[PDB]
Tab-separated table of C-alpha atoms in Angstrom:
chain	number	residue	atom	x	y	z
A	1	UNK	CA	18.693	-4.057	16.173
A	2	UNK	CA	15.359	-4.653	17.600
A	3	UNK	CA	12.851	-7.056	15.651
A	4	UNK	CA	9.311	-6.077	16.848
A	5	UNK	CA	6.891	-9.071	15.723
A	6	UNK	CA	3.221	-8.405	15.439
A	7	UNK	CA	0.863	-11.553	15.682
A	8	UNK	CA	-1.326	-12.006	13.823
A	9	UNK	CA	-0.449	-10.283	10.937
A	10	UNK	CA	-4.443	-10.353	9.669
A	11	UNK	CA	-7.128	-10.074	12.498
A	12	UNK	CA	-11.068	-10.773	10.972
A	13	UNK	CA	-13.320	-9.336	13.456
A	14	UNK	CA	-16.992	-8.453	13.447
A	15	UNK	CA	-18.290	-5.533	14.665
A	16	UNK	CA	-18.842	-4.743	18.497
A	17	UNK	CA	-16.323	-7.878	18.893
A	18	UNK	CA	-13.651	-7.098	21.165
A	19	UNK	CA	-10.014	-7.306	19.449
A	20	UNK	CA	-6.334	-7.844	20.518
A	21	UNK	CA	-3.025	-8.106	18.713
A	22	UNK	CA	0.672	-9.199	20.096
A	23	UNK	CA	3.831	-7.386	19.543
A	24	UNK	CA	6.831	-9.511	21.045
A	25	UNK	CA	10.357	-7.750	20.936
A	26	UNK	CA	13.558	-9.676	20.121
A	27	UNK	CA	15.049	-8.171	23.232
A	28	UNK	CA	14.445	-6.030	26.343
A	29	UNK	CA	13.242	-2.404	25.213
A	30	UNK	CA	13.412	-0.643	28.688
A	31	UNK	CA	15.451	2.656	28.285
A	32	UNK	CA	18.228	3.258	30.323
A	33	UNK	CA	16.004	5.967	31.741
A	34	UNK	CA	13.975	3.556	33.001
A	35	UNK	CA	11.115	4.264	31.021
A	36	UNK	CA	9.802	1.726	27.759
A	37	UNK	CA	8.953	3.888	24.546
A	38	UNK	CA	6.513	1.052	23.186
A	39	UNK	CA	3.527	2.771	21.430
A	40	UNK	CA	0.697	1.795	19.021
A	41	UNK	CA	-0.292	3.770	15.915
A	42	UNK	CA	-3.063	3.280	13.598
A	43	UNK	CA	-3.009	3.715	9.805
A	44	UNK	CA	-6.144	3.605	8.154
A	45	UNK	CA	-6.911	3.551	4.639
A	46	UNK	CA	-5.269	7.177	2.675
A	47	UNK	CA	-4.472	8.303	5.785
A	48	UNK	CA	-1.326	8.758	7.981
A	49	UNK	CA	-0.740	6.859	11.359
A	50	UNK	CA	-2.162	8.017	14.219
A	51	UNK	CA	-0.910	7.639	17.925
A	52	UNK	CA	-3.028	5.561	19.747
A	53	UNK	CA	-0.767	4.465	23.013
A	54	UNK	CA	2.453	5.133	24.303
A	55	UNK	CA	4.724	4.382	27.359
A	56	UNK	CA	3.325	0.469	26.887
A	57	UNK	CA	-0.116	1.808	28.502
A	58	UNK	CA	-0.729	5.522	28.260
A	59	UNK	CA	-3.982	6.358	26.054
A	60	UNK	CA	-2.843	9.405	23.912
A	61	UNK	CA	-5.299	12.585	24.185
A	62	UNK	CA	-8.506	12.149	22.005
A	63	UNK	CA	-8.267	8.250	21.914
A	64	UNK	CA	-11.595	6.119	22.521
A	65	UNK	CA	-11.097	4.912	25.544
A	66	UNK	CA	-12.028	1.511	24.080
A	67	UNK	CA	-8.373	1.503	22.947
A	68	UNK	CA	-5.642	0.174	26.006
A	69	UNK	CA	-1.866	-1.207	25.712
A	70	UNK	CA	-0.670	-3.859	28.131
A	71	UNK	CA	2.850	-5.580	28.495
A	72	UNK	CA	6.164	-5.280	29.767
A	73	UNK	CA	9.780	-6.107	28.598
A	74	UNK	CA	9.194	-7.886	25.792
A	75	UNK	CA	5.241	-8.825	24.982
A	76	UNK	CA	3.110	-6.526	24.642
A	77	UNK	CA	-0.564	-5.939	23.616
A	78	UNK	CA	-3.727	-3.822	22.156
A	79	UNK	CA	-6.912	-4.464	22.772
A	80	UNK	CA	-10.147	-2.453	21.412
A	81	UNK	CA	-12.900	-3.451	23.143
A	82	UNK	CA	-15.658	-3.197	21.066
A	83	UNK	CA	-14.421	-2.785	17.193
A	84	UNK	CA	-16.357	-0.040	15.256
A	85	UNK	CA	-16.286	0.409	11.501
A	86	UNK	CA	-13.783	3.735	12.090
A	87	UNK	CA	-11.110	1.198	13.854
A	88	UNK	CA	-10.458	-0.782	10.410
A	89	UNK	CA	-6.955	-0.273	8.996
A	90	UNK	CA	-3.580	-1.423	10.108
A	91	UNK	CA	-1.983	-1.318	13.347
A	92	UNK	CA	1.761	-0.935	14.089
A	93	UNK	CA	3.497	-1.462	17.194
A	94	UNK	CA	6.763	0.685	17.271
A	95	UNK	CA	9.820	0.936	20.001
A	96	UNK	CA	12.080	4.090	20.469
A	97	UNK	CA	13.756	2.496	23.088
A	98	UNK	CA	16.695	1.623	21.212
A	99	UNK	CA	18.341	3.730	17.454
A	100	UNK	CA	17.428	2.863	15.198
A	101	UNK	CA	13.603	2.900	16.049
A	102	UNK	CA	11.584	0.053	14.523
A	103	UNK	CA	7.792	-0.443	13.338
A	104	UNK	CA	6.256	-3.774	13.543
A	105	UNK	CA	5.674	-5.152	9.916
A	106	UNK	CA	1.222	-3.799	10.908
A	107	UNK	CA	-1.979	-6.193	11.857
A	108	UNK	CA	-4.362	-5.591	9.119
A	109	UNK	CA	-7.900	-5.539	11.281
A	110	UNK	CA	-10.735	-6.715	8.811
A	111	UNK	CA	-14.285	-7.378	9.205
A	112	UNK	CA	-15.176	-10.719	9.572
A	113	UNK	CA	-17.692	-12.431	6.359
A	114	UNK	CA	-18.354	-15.947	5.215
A	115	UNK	CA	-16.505	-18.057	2.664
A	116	UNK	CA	-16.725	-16.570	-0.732
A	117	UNK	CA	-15.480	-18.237	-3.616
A	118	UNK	CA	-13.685	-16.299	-6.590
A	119	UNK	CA	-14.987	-15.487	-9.936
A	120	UNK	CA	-12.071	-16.377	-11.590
A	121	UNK	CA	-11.736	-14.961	-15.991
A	122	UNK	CA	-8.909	-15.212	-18.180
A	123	UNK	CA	-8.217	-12.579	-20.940
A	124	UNK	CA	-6.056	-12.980	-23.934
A	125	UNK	CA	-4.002	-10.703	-25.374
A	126	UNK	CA	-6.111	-7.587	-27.244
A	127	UNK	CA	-5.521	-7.458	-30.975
A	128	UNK	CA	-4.230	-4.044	-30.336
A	129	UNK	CA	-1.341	-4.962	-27.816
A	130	UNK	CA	-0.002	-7.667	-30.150
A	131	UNK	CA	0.393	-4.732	-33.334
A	132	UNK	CA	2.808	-3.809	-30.590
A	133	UNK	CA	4.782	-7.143	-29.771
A	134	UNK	CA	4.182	-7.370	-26.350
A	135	UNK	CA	1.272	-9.510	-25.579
A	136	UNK	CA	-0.613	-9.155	-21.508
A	137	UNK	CA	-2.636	-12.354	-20.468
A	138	UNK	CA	-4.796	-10.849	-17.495
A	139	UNK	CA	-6.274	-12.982	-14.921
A	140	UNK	CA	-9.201	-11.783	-12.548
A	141	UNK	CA	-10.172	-13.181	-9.153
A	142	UNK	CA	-12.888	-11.572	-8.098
A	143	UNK	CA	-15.326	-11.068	-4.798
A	144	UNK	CA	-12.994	-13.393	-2.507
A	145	UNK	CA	-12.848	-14.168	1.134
A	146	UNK	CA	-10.661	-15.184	3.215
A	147	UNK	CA	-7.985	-12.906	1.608
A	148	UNK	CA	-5.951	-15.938	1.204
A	149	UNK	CA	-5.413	-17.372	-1.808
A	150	UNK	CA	-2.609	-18.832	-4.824
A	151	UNK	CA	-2.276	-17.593	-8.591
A	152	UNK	CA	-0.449	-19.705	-10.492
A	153	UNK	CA	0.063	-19.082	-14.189
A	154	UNK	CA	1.113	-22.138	-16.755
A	155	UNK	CA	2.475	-21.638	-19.755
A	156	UNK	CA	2.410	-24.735	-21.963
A	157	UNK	CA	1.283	-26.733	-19.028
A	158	UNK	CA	4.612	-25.704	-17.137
A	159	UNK	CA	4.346	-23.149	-14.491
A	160	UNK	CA	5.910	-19.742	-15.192
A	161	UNK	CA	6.649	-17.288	-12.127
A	162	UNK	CA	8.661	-14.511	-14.572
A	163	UNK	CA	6.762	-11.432	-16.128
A	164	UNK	CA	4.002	-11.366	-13.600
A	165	UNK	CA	2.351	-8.112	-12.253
A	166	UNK	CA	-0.543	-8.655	-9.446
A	167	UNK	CA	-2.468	-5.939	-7.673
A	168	UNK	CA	-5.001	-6.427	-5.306
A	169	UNK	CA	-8.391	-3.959	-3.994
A	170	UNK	CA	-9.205	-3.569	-0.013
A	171	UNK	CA	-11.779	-5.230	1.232
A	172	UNK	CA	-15.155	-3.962	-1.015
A	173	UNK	CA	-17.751	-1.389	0.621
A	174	UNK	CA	-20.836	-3.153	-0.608
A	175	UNK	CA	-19.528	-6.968	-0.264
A	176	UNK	CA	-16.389	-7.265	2.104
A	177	UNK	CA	-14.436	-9.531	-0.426
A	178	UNK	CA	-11.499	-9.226	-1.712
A	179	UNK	CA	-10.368	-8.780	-5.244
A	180	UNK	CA	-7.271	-9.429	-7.403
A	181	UNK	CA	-5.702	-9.184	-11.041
A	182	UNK	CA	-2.643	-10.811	-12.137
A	183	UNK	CA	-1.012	-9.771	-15.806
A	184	UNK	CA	1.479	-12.111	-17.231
A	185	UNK	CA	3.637	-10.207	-20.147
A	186	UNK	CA	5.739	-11.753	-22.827
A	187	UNK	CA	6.797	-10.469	-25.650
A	188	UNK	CA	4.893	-10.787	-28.914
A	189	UNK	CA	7.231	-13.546	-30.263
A	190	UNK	CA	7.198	-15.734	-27.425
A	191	UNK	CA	3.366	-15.388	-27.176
A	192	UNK	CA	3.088	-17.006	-30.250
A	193	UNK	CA	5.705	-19.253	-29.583
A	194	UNK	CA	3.388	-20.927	-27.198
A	195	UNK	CA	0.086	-21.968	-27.206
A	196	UNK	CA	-1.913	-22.599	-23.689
A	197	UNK	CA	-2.361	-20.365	-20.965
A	198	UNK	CA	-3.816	-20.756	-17.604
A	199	UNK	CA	-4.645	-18.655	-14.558
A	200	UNK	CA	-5.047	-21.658	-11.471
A	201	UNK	CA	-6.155	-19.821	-8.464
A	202	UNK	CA	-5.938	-22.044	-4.915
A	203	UNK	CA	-8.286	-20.968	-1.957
A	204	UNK	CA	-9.785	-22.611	0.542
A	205	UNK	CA	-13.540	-22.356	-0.848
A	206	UNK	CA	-12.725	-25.740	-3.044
A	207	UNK	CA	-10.152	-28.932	-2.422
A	208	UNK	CA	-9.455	-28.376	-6.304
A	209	UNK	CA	-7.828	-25.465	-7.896
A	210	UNK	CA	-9.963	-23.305	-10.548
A	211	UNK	CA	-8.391	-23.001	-14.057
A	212	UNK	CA	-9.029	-21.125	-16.515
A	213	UNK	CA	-7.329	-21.510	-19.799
A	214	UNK	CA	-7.574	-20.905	-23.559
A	215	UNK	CA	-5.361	-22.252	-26.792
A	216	UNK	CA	-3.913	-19.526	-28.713
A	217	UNK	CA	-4.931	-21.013	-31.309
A	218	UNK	CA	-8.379	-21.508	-30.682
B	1	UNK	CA	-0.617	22.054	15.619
B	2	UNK	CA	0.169	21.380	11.538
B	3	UNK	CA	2.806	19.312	9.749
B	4	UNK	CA	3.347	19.838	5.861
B	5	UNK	CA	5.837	18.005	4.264
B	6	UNK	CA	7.214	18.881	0.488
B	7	UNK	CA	9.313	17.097	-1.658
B	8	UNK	CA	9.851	16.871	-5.771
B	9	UNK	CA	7.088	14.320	-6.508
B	10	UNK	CA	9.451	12.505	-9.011
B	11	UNK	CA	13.029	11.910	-9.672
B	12	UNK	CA	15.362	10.209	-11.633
B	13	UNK	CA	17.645	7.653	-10.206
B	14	UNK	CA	21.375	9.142	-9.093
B	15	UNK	CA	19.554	12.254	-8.291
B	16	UNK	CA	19.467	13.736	-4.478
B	17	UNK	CA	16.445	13.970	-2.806
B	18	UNK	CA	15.319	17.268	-0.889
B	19	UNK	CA	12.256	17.182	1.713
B	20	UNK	CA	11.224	19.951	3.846
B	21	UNK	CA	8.628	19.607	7.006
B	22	UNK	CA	7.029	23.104	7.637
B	23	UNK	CA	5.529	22.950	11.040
B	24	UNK	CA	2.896	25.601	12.221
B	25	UNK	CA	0.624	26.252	15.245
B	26	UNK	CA	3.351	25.673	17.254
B	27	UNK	CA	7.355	26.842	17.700
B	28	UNK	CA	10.398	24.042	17.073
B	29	UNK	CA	12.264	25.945	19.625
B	30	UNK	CA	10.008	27.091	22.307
B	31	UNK	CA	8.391	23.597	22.277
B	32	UNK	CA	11.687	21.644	22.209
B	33	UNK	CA	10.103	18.652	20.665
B	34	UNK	CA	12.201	16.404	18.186
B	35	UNK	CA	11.561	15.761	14.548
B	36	UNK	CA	11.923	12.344	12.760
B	37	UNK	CA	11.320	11.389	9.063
B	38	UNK	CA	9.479	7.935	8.381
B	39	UNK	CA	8.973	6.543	5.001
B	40	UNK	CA	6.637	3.934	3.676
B	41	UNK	CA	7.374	2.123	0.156
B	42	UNK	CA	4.181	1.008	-1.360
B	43	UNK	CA	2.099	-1.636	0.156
B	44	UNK	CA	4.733	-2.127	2.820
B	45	UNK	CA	5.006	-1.205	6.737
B	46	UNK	CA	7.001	1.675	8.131
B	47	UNK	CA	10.540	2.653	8.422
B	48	UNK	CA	12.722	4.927	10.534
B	49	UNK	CA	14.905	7.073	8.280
B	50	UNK	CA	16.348	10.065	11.384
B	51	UNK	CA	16.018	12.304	13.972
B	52	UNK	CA	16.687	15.618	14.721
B	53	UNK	CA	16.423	17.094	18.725
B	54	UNK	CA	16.047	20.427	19.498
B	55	UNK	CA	19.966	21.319	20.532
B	56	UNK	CA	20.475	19.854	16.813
B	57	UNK	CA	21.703	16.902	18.030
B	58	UNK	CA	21.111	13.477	15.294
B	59	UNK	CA	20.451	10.101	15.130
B	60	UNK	CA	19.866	8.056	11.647
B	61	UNK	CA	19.007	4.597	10.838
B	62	UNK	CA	22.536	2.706	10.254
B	63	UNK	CA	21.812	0.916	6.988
B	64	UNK	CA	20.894	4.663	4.983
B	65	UNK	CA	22.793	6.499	7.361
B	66	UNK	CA	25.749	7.267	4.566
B	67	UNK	CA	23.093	8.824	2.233
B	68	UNK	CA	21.418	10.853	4.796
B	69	UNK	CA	21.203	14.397	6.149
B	70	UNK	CA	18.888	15.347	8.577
B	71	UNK	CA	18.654	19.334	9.427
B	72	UNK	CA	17.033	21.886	10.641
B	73	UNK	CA	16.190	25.660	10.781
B	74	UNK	CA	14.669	26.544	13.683
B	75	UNK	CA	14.082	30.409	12.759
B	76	UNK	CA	11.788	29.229	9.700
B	77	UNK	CA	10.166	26.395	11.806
B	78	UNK	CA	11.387	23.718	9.372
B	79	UNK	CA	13.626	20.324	9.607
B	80	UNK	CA	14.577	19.065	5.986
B	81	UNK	CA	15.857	15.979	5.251
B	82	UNK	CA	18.406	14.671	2.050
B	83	UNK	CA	18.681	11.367	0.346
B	84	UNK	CA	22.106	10.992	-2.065
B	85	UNK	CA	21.614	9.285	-4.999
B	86	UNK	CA	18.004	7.573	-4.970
B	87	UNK	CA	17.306	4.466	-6.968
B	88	UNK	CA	14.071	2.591	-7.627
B	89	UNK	CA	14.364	1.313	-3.774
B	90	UNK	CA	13.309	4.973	-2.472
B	91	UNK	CA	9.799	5.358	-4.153
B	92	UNK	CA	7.709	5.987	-0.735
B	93	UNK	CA	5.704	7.973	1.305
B	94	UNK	CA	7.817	9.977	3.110
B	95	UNK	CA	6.115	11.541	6.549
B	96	UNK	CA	7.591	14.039	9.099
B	97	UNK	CA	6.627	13.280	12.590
B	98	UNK	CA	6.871	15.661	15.728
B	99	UNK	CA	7.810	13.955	19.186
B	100	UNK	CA	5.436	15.744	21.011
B	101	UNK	CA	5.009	15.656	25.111
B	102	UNK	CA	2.969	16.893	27.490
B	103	UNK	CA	3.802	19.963	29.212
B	104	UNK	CA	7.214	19.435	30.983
B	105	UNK	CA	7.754	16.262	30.938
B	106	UNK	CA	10.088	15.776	28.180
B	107	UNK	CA	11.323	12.391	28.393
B	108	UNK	CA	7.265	11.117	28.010
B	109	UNK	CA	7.704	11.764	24.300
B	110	UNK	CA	6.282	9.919	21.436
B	111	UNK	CA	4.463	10.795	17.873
B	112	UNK	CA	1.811	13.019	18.674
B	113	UNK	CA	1.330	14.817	15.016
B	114	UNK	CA	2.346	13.296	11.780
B	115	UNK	CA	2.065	15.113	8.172
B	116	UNK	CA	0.053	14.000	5.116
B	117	UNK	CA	2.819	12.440	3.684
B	118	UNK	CA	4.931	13.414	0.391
B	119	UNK	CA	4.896	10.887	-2.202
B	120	UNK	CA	8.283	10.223	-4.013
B	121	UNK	CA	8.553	8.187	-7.389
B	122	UNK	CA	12.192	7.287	-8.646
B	123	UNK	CA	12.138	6.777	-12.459
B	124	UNK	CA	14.080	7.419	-15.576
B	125	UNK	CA	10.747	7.389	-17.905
B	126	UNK	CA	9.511	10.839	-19.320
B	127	UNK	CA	6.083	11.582	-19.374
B	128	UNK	CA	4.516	8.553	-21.551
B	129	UNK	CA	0.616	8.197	-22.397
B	130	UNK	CA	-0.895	4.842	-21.366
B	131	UNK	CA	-1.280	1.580	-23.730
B	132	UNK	CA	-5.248	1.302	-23.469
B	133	UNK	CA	-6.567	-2.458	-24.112
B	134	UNK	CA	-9.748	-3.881	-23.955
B	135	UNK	CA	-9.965	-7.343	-22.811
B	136	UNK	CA	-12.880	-9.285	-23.913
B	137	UNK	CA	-13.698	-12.938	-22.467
B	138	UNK	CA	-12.233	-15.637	-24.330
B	139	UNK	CA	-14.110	-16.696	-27.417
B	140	UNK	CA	-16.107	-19.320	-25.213
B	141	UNK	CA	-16.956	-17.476	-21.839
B	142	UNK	CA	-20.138	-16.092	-22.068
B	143	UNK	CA	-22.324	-19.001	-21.138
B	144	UNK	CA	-23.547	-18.672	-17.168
B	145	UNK	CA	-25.455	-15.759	-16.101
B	146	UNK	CA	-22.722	-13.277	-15.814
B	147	UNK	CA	-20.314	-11.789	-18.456
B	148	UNK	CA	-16.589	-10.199	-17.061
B	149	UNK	CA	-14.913	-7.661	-19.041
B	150	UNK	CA	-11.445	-5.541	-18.605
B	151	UNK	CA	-9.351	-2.911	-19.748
B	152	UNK	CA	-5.654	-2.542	-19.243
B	153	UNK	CA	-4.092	0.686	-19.150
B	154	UNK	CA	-0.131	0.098	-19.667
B	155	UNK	CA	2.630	1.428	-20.056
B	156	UNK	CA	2.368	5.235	-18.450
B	157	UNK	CA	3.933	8.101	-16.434
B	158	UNK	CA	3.262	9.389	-13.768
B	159	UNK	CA	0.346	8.962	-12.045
B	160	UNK	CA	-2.737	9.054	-11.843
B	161	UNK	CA	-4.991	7.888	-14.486
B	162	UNK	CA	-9.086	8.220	-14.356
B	163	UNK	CA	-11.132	5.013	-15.516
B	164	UNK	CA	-14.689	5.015	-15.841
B	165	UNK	CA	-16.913	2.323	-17.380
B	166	UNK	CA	-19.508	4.063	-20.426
B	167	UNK	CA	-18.423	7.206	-18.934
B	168	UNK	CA	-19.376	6.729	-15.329
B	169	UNK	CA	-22.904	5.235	-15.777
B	170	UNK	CA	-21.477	1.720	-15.075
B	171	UNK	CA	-20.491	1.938	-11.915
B	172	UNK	CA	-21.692	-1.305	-9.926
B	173	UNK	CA	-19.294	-4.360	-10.259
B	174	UNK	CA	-16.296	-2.665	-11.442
B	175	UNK	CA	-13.237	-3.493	-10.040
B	176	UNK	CA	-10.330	-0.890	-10.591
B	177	UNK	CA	-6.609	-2.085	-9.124
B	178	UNK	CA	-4.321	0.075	-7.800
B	179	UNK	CA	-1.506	0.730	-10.577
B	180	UNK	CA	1.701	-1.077	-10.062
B	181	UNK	CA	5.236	0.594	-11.185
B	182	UNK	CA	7.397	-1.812	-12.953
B	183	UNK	CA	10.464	-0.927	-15.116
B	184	UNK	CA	10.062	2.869	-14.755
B	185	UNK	CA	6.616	2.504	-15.789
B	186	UNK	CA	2.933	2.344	-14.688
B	187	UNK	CA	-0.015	-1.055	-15.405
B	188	UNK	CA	-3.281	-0.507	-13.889
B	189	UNK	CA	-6.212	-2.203	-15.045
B	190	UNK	CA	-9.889	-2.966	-14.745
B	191	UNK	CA	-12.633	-5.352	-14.362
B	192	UNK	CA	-16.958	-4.984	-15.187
B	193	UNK	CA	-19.125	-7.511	-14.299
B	194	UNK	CA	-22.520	-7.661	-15.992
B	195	UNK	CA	-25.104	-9.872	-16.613
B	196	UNK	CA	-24.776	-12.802	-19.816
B	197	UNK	CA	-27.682	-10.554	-21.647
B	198	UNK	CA	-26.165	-6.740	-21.397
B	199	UNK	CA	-22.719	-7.886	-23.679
B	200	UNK	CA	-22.376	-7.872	-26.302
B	201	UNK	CA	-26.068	-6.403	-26.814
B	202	UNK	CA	-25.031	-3.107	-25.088
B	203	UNK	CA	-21.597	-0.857	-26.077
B	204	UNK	CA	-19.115	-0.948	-23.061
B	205	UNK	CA	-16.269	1.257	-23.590
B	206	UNK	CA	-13.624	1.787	-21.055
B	207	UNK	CA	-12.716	5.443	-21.105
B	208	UNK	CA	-8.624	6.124	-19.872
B	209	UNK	CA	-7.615	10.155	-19.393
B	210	UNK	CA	-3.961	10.596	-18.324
B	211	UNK	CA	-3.593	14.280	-17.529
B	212	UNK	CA	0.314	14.549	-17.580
B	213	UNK	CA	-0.182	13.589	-21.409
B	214	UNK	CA	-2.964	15.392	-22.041
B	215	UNK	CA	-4.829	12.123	-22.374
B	216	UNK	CA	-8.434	10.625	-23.019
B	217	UNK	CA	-8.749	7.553	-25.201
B	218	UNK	CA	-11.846	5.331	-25.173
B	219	UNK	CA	-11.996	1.624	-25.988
B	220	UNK	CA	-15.151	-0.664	-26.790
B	221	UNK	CA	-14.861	-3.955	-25.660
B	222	UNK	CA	-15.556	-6.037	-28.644
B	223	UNK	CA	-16.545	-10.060	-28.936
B	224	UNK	CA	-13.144	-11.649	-30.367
């Protein structure tokens, strides 16, 4: 079936910018009726997708007109011509050419900021969690940008990739950065079985990594 | 031209899932338009579940299509759709869309109207009250001009919680994460930044109410 494959899949624009994102199909997605059922939709933020192009080209009814769709065959683009705060969310290409229909995987459109490092803080285990043998370690990285960046938790100096829980925020109303937390569990026992723990996060504002640890014992 | 799609909210796995899309403004079958259901699993992209055309004729996605029935009843302006035995794979958005066209020309079709969406969550937990922790720095991080302080709220079903900061009054630099479903249950939590000299001087309490328990529990951060 028909891979549809969006590039890029994260577009940082700034506002009144023009912007344009591929979709490339693995194969031909011309109908036998001659016709090519490639459309765009957007999804923003709580919302369900809305149709933005069809037939490659076609603006749907109500669409800025600063919206168009380009392409035949196989590559195909959207372009917004001048990107307004209302146009942020993802976009999907999607072909019904062919059952079963298939989405691109979405190009999140961002606005454009400058480099922000994270504020990165480490938080033991509450007294109260550990009357309960399981014991969270909760890493924040906070008021980031690019999105792009590497947790890494070490147990003991040895990296440990099982028990981990992350969750992320959009990008913030008043700042544009990006925000995550990360919560390694264990139970109570192995907790205090062990006795450092770090949160090392990897982004592109420094060459080095930023660590934060503590000693159980400390 | 309205779409409403309804569903059961939350089941167990093993169990069959029954949606219904209730269409209005318009007629299924003077309008002849198709019907397809679309689901999105949390934080992921978009996936095509089946179709239904006007003559009642079907397509479905081949990888769910044992599990699936797609239907219709055209006199009560619905098209339902049924998953078999759902497991912790099917927790999604699931959307009815219309393939609309414009006046006659039918084969110009494409997904004019979608609904709001009808969330499903698969899990075997019973209602459970969150796990509310506060997390205060490290016994060492509170040098530099800014203090961070959390709360994590574990452990819980269904969703939603509320979290406020001292009731709502601290409301700049608070970060609060989308929860996160793992093994049947629920882990959100939640970050305050504020300067070195308001903690510990000044009480900050994290304040958790879960209304499927019945819920409200406060927590003062506290220097370790």
């Amino acid at each position: 079936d028909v891979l549809m494959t969006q590039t890029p899949l994260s577009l940082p624009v700034n506002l009144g910018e023009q912007a344009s994102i591929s979709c490339r199909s693995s194969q031909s997605i011309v109908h036998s009726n001659g016709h090519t059922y490639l459309e765009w939709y957007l999804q923003r933020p709580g919302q369900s997708p809305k149709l933005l192009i069809y037939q490659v080209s076609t603006r749907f009814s109500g669409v800025p007109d600063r919206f168009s769709g380009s392409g035949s065959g196989t590559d195909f683009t959207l372009r917004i011509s001048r990107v307004e705060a209302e146009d942020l969310g993802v976009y999907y290409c999607f072909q019904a050419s062919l059952v079963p229909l298939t989405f691109g995987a979405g190009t999140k459109l961002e606005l454009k900021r400058a480099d922000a490092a994270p504020t990165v803080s480490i938080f033991p285990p509450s007294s109260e969690q550990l009357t309960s043998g399981g014991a969270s370690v909760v890493c924040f990285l906070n008021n980031f940008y690019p999105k792009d960046i590497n947790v890494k938790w070490k147990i003991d100096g040895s990296e440990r990739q099982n028990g981990v829980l992350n969750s992320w925020t959009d990008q913030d109303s008043k700042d544009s950065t990006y925000s995550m937390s990360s919560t390694l569990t264990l139970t109570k026992d192995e907790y205090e079985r062990h006795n450092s723990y770090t949160c090392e996060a990897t982004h592109k504002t420094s060459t080095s990594p930023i660590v934060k640890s503590f000693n159980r014992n400390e | 031209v309205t779409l409403k799609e309804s569903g059961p909210g939350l089941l167990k796995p093993s169990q069959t899932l029954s949606l219904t899309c209730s269409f209005s403004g318009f007629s299924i079958r003077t309008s002849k338009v198709g019907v397809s259901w679309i689901r999105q699993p949390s934080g992921k992209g978009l996936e095509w579940l089946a179709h239904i055309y006007w003559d009642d004729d079907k397509r479905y996605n081949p990888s769910l299509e044992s599990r699936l029935t797609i239907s219709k009843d055209t006199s009560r302006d619905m098209v339902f759709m049924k998953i078999t035995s759902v497991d912790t794979a099917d927790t999604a958005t699931y959307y009815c869309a219309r393939r609309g066209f414009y006046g006659r020309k039918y084969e110009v079709n494409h997904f004019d109207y979608w609904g709001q969406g009808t969330t499903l969550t698969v899990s075997s937990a019973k209602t459970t009250a969150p796990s509310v922790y506060p997390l205060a720095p490290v016994c060492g991080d509170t040098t530099g001009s800014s203090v961070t302080l959390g709360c994590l709220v574990k452990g819980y079903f269904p969703e939603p919680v509320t979290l406020t900061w001292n009731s709502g009054s601290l409301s700049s630099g608070v970060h609060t994460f989308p929860a996160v479903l793992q093994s049947d249950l629920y882990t959100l939590s939640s970050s305050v930044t504020v300067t070195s000299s308001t903690w510990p001087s000044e009480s900050i309490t994290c304040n958790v109410a879960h209304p499927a328990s019945s819920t409200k529990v406060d927590k003062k951060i506290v220097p370790r």
